[PDB]
From a paper:
AIM2 is a critically important cytoplasmic dsDNA sensor that activates caspase-1 to provide host defense against pathogens. AIM2 contains an N-terminal PYD and a C-terminal dsDNA-binding HIN domain.
The symmetry that was found, a rise of 6.0 Å and a right-handed rotation of 138.9° per subunit, generated a reconstruction where the PYD was seen to be largely α-helical. The AIM2PYD subunit in the filament shows a six-helix bundle structure that is highly similar to the AIM2PYD crystal structures in isolation. In the filament, AIM2PYD forms the core while the GFP tag packs tightly outside. Estimation of resolutions by Fourier shell correlation between the densities and the fitted molecules gave ~5.0 Å for the AIM2PYD region and ~11 Å if GFP is included. While the GFP-AIM2PYD filament has the symmetry of a right-handed 1-start helix with 138.9° rotation and 6.0 Å axial rise per subunit, the sequential intrastrand subunits do not make direct molecular contact. If we sequentially label the AIM2PYD subunits according to the helical operator, the three types of interactions that dictate helical assembly in the AIM2PYD filament will be between the first (i) and the fourth (i+3) subunits for the type I contacts, between the first (i) and the sixth (i+5) subunits for the type II contacts, and between the first (i) and the third (i+2) for the type III contacts. Gln54 and Asn55 at the end of the α4 helix interact with Asn73, Tyr74 and Leu76 in between α5-α6 of an adjacent molecule to form the type II contacts. Type III interactions are mediated by Gly38 and Lys39 of α3 and the nearby Asp15, Asn16 and Ile17 residues of another subunit.
Numbering used by the authors:
A (entry chain G), B (entry chain B), C (entry chain E), D (entry chain D), E (entry chain C), F (entry chain J), ...: 0 to 93
The structure:
């Protein structure tokens, strides 16, 4: 399904690549896109964080907000690639 | 009957999906909608809890209060879906 | 009831925000306000700890002692806010 | 029987070797091969998980889907070995 | 009776204080004082363990052996206190 | 919110620019504006230091004290700019 | 109690001030005052180390030995202050 | 019994002294003396690991293999001491 | 890949040869080709600097801008050689 | 087994000798022999890195690729020795 | 506080003015006023040296000894000024 | 104990005095007295190096070899003093 495929993008192409130090910076500017919380985020395995994000918004808004953040944290090289892969999947369901 | 159908919603679409940890949190904020009790709730198999809830209020008030709680515990993704399915069944008997 | 409302304050505004490391420090200076115990406290889910505290003192003394501790552990930012919310609820029942 | 032998493969050669962390990753990409569920899977002893898988599909489809997953989660070293052992048992009943 | 009082010592002053991790270590060096057993001990609620100990030796030998163990597992702070309380009760019946 | 915007100023315009050697000098003259401490400050990632500062004073007093320090450590070029950006945000909420 | 007050001294006036590097040096000359151990000490959060020290000696001997060590590791500035605060508390119970 | 005494050697003189990092290295070269396994060993409290070792070989072969490993991992200082203590106990039963 | 080969050029033929003093001069005229920053650049191991450059522009624009800078800092002897090697690799993929 | 012996070569003769700085350089030219990844490699204890390498290729291809890399990073002194030791073990199984 | 003000004198009026060559000469005649050491002093940033001096003597004896040294190393022009500023601060607390 | 006293000599009279540059020279001529290793020594805090030396030889052979090295690296001024202090401690236990 489109859902499973989006998740594979998030996990395999996204988190299975990104580092840590940067995740700490991401957390410092978080809460600006999702109605999550503080102390609550501090130690949550990538899988847990992705799951909590989806349990709230979804594979639609979560992906969009991720794209938006990737553009803020300077991360443009990985933001362009995600945008391209997104469009590739969209074409399959247009 | 409308009753049996509501029960199928509760059990198959509701409890047959939700986790545990969250049930503990539900219990911690319970007693706010139903005239049930304490120590009495601690270990009651989903089937027992649903049955006790209905034996008191019913398939009308129990479902309404469940909808209301699902909106409190942040659980909105599963609350919207329940609300949609509810309306679908209501249309059949309007 | 005033009781349920106080609990919502404790849980949603208090524990649903505070971290862990600090909870360990809290435990190290505990037993100074409540007639609880040792080894007994080591691993007790926030819900369990709140419940045990109330089962002993109550929503009156437990809240007061929490306010007092929040002022000791330097935690003043969250102590002022709790004090303000407390006064807001008190006004409703004055 | 072929059934008991397949189970011995699954349990002794498979699960009696694989780690945990990876099981969490497996769970995150599950539900893609079996008509099982969520929250339902979270804590199920290897024996319980194998049994539920078989109770649904069987020793035929469950083994095939396991082989397929072992190839996805990069796990190729253990996937080749399982494929070899499978062929060895197939020869005995050809 | 002297028996009930000794039990109150064991339970309230002893077990109602001691932790877990240490209980595992106690179990690892057990069977050296009581003619109990293995696998049999692994999961036995403090109340069950105390009861089985007494059902064998009694409130006389069980207490003496507990005192002796408390001195081995380094636990001297709690061993001195138990010895003092013991002497206090002995004086009442001398 | 005004809070998030102030934080973006602090982090992106402030710390994401300033060097290290100078941070050591800042630390040597610190404790003069905030009720923090010693040895406690020695190794705290910019994100940690900003967070601890806010957890005490806030986005109001922390920013004001930062402005004041930036004027002491000769740092005037970056102090004027911060003051200008501050006034720009203030105008939006006047 | 005198105990709680001594602990506040140890933690707030002592450890909440001292650095790390020096703690490593302390550990290198430890075992000379307490019947503790090696490898066992290597990574123990200040709270854990204080607790283990007390669980053995107490708030009487642990404080005395700390005073003595503070005088050895050259640390005299913090040793005089601790001695003064100690005498201040002693006067309250003389 | 000789068994209990050997266990006291293993636990008190051995594991109650050795560190962690080195245990990870031990695990990396394990499986070379005992017919145990992988993933299975990763997280097993010293008590659990000792027990599993004995449940397989015993207090005779387990001790001998431990002595042998202690000589490989360079650990000679602790290997000589264990060998001496072993001989001391052997003399008691010669 | 062309990417890996370009990196080998940068690192082995470029940085593994150039000195320091000159790197300081390079830094003084930097920020003119890449959207990087200040204080941020001061101490970044050649590997870190190359990686940050690529993480922004890439192996295409980073190499081109390097060529351009090598021509400015008078460095022509090493600029001609880089240009020749570049053309040699281009021919392989024309 | 040949496997265990190869591992002893890798760990004791290889990694237990090589430095760090050079490991960073190795990482910069990695991914050219193994189908591993980025950010994923950044902080992985020698034991973890060896294990991941083997979990993919094995003690056959991993050793061969290591030999090949040791010849690239100029490291010839340690490459000749590894090649000699390899041949010595091969002779034992020819 | 008087302490902070003395530090500002030391750092801003003292070290933020004095050169290097002379610091080497100061070091050559040091150890005559403070119970510090050798090799230990060789490379210690002004901030580190001031801090170590205070950590030993204090803002009282350290300042007095500095005044005394400033009079020895011929440095009289800066010694008179320091003495004047000292008296000015003393008057504020007389 | 004689051991602790020897360690105090090593650390306080030895390492707490010696410089760095010379430590690099020591390392270059090391491995000639102890069965240690290379790359392994490069960055090991004085405390770590002393501990590893003792973990191998001891406070007897390590001290003797240190004395011997101190005589080689020309260091005679500190070698005579160590020899004198050694004899002073020996007299106490003759």
């Amino acid at each position: 399904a489109m859902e499973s495929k989006y998740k594979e993008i998030l996990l395999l192409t996204g988190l299975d690549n990104i580092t840590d130090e940067e995740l700490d910076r991401f957390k410092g500017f978080l809460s600006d896109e999702f109605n999550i919380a503080t102390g609550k985020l501090h130690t949550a395995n990538r899988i847990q964080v992705a799951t909590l994000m989806i349990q709230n918004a979804g594979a639609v808004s979560a992906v969009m907000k991720t794209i938006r953040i990737f553009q803020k944290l300077n991360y443009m090289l990985l933001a362009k690639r995600l945008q391209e892969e997104k469009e590739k999947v969209d074409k399959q369901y247009k």
